[PDB]
Design a protein around this ligand. Structure first.
Ligand SMILES: O=C(O)[C@@H]1C[C@]2(C(=O)O)C=C[C@@H](O)[C@@H](C2)O1
Ligand SMILES: O=C(O)[C@@H]1C[C@]2(C(=O)O)C=C[C@@H](O)[C@@H](C2)O1
Ligand SMILES: [Mn+2]
Ligand SMILES: [Mn+2]
Lengths: 79, 449, 449, 79
């Protein structure tokens, strides 16, 4: 029954991850809205590269997690 | 030192002569100031030379641009801001042809429809100027069809023999692009291996690798199931050149029409688009597809008048309206223009020019563009079109196959101090090899459903 | 009630007659127990009927299986466990043809290479039995070529007229699959719209939507760039049928060879693969590609002996070795078999059968398979091949285009109590419409680079 | 300067997310290794459907985040 206990932990970790992802998107939106009301661009290319780079410790899938977080924050491009 | 050519044809239909003469009697901005007698001698040489393009290719382009107008293809237009005789060499031409092909396969995958490829090539040798005297106190450089880039007075005098040098450079370049497009450069699998080398070596490659890999799987899939045209364009600016290169042929209705055979398509710039001027009137007499640049002082009402003068027969794709508002202005200024034109019943191509509304002088003394502003205008352009339900038809971009240091930003994060490295443009800053590819990838994302 | 057929051809080459006679004089397991005189009369009828397949199609299959063997294509083999005369109808056949086409386009995209499609169809009418008396005390049902499914003694008697009924049902079915594969069912875009309806309506669709969308973009891309064969197979079990359907034709060397024209390819099962038996010897005399099922008592040494007897001329793709170890045994038992065979220099196709090593009786009294065990054996099969550097060549699966309730699990999460809903198989449990599609998607992920 | 402050927060949220993702993968591995030593399968289809379903509140990209977490835990298929 170590599996139930370990799955019990994964459930917590998923509730924790989900909540920090929802948070990050709301903050990401507020940075975008402030910059745009002040006459600035929607996206900042160099900053998105920093975000991608800091998930590289996860391996090949790290950049795809970062890109997915960027989409939740500033939306899909051309929409 | 000099080639020597001696001077010592059937008449146009009476109505085409009358209309051409009338177009050319209208006032024309931004023309060279050389003598009429010398211009006439040079035009007589050009009137008998083999053309750069042929009518059947122009009729075929029109059919492909009609699909773009109807929402079933996408237009990619790009190349040097200013072509120079100096860089009209095999490596430079091949580098630009390859860049355009690389961007096109990426855009085709993203758009899920054909991409029509129009190069700024084989003729982009003339530019307009707001000032006739530049920052060094010299007469302004107006492109190699008019005068020399060299910062001295003798070089800057307007020289009509450059009409013929321009033709010679245009023919030679076009010959090579035809050769290159039926060669191994054609192959979609070779073209996309270059993009994957770009992904592997670019500092921002992780941004683009998923999409590059997905494209590669689309290409391999196509092959697992058992499974190039580049058009020439330039700004029609110098009327002595464009008139010398007119030729009569039967058009898309079987009646004789005048084709400008210096290119496949031409556009009319911001400073020469006077509604009652010679450039707009000249565009009305030729059978080629045409484009007009529209800046931030465009009204919805003037846009419609261009459409009604230039597309009088309601031919989808005959007219392109090229938006260049600035990234901070496009979202507000474009929608009213698009709504008013859509309501006429005409089907124009809407094309984004994210370059010319976004230029600024750096502290190091170089005119430059920021990548984020270029991307933001294309993005805003797509948003305007999503909201109205209209087709974002294409992009008009200035690029090079060389690793220049001209536009700020990108994966390389080019700075003001790096701009001195090799700022090689004869005029406006080009997106280099890497930055052009980046934009194609970003725009391909914008095109996704 | 009964069709009536009266009984009242050129000789084989002397060496082929000698070899055929010798193969058939060897002992044969699992044969029907009907009289020899009645069997002979039925075989005489079948000796003059139009064949189900033709030699040129078998030679073409061989060329395609050679590519699979060399690591440049993938084999998908699937269909009903047992075909019945009862369900040999247009909707049932169309449902299976469509399922195979749906799975194939998914696998092609994942593998980035061609997928060869072999249906268990137009002949899968016979099965072996470990017990001659079943759980109801009746003589065992051995497939519609031998006796009836109905639980009564009269129905279970072995009936030689079923050889001819089997042929008639095989011809009719094959006629329809030929028709269906040159119809609109062919179109890859139509086939993949069904997969996207599956994604939209399946409870586990979110698991598969990204991949379905990526495939759809590959198909649209292919179309933006300007851009069906299903083979028949069954277990060669009943030697009276297979011998009656032999025909002489010039083979891939221009010399007369014997082709079994009851199908394109056949396999020899676990209970009839005696190395000195009639089935293996019969397989040695025919020109068709052949397969042998290998279970958990297979030794590396016996596997090589099959290869050397069945592929004596070293013809890539002539022999398929079909692994069915059980999901818990495949990782340990397969590697030694693969290493020993690779070392002979022969190029067999390695095919996974994830079904037959993983069957269990449910508490509700139905023989059933769990989806997770089926997926786990295919997965372990891929792991064995990655580690050795060899080619995972295909899968051999039992499926239906109907929403049956036969295998436990999947997106629907079929339970023991749900198995009674419509358990329709005449023999082993089939993966339904949804579960077959799920496995194709999962295996396509396994195939990705 | 609300942008620097807000970006300062996103940095924290990314360090937080990264660390919970690394954790989840290690726990996911331990559940897989226990089940396999005991004669069980590598993957459990119904459980992966639960994991996908509980990121659905993020919208369309939710399932792709879950699938990415599953890959970090039990690896890519057929490898
Ligand atoms: O400048 C920013 O910080 C914000 C947040 C953002 C993100 O989602 O992290 C990062 C970079 C920008 O493109 C967008 C998205 O605006
Ligand atoms: O059974 C499990 O819980 C573990 C963890 C896992 C996950 O990554 O969440 C979920 C389901 C299974 O396929 C794998 C991966 O094993
Ligand atoms: Mn320019
Ligand atoms: Mn079976």
């Amino acid at each position: 029954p170590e599996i139930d206990t370990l799955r019990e932990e994964i459930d917590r970790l998923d509730a924790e991850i989900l909540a920090l992802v929802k948070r990050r998107a709301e903050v990401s939106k507020a940075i975008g809205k402030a910059r745009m009301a002040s006459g600035g661009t929607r996206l900042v290319h160099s900053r998105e590269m920093k975000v991608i780079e800091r998930y590289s410790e996860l391996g090949p899938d790290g950049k795809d997690l970062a890109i997915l977080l960027l989409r939740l924050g500033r939306g899909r491009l051309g929409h | 030192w000099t080639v020597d050519i001696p001077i010592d044809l059937p008449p146009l239909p009476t109505d085409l002569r009358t209309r051409l003469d009338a177009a050319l009697a209208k006032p024309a901005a931004q023309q060279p100031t050389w003598p009429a007698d010398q211009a006439l001698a040079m035009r007589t040489v050009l009137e008998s030379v083999p053309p750069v393009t042929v009518p059947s290719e122009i009729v075929r382009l029109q059919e492909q641009l009609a699909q773009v107008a109807k929402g079933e293809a996408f237009l990619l237009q790009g190349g040097d801001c200013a072509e120079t005789f100096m860089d009209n060499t095999e490596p430079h031409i091949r580098g630009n042809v390859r860049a355009l092909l690389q961007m096109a396969v990426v855009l085709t995958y993203g758009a899920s429809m054909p991409v029509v490829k129009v190069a700024r090539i084989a003729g982009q040798y003339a530019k307009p100027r707001s000032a006739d005297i530049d920052a060094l106190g010299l007469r302004s450089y107006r492109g190699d069809m008019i005068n020399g880039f060299a910062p001295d007075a003798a070089a800057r005098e307007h020289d009509p023999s450059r009409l013929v040098r321009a033709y010679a450079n245009a023919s030679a370049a076009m010959n090579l692009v035809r050769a290159l497009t039926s060669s191994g450069l054609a192959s979609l699998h070779l073209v996309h291996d270059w993009n994957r080398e770009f992904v592997r070596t670019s500092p921002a490659g992780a941004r683009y690798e998923a999409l590059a890999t997905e494209i590669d799987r689309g290409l391999r899939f196509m092959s697992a199931c058992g499974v190039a045209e580049i058009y020439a364009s330039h700004e029609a600016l110098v009327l002595d050149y464009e008139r010398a290169m007119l030729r009569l042929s039967d058009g898309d209705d079987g009646e004789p029409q005048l084709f400008d055979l210096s290119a496949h398509t031409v556009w009319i710039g911001e400073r020469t688009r006077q509604i009652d001027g010679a450039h707009i009137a000249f565009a009305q007499v030729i059978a080629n597809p045409v484009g007009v640049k529209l800046g931030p002082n465009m009204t919805p009402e003037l846009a419609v008048e261009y459409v009604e003068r230039l597309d009088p027969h309601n031919k989808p794709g005959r007219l392109t309206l090229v938006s260049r508002m600035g990234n901070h202005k496009v979202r507000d200024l474009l929608p009213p223009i698009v709504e008013k034109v859509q309501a006429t019943g005409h089907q124009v191509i809407w094309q984004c020019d994210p370059m010319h509304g976004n230029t600024h002088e750096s502290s190091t003394g170089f005119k430059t563009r920021h990548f984020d502003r270029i991307v933001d205008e294309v993005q805003g352009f797509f948003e305007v079109h999503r909201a109205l339900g209209t087709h974002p038809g294409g992009i008009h971009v200035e690029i090079t196959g060389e690793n220049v240091t001209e536009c700020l930003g990108g994966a390389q994060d080019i700075s003001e101090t790096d701009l001195a490295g090799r700022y090689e443009t004869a005029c406006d800053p080009r997106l280099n090899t890497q930055q052009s590819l980046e934009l194609a990838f970003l725009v391909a994302e914008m095109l996704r459903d």
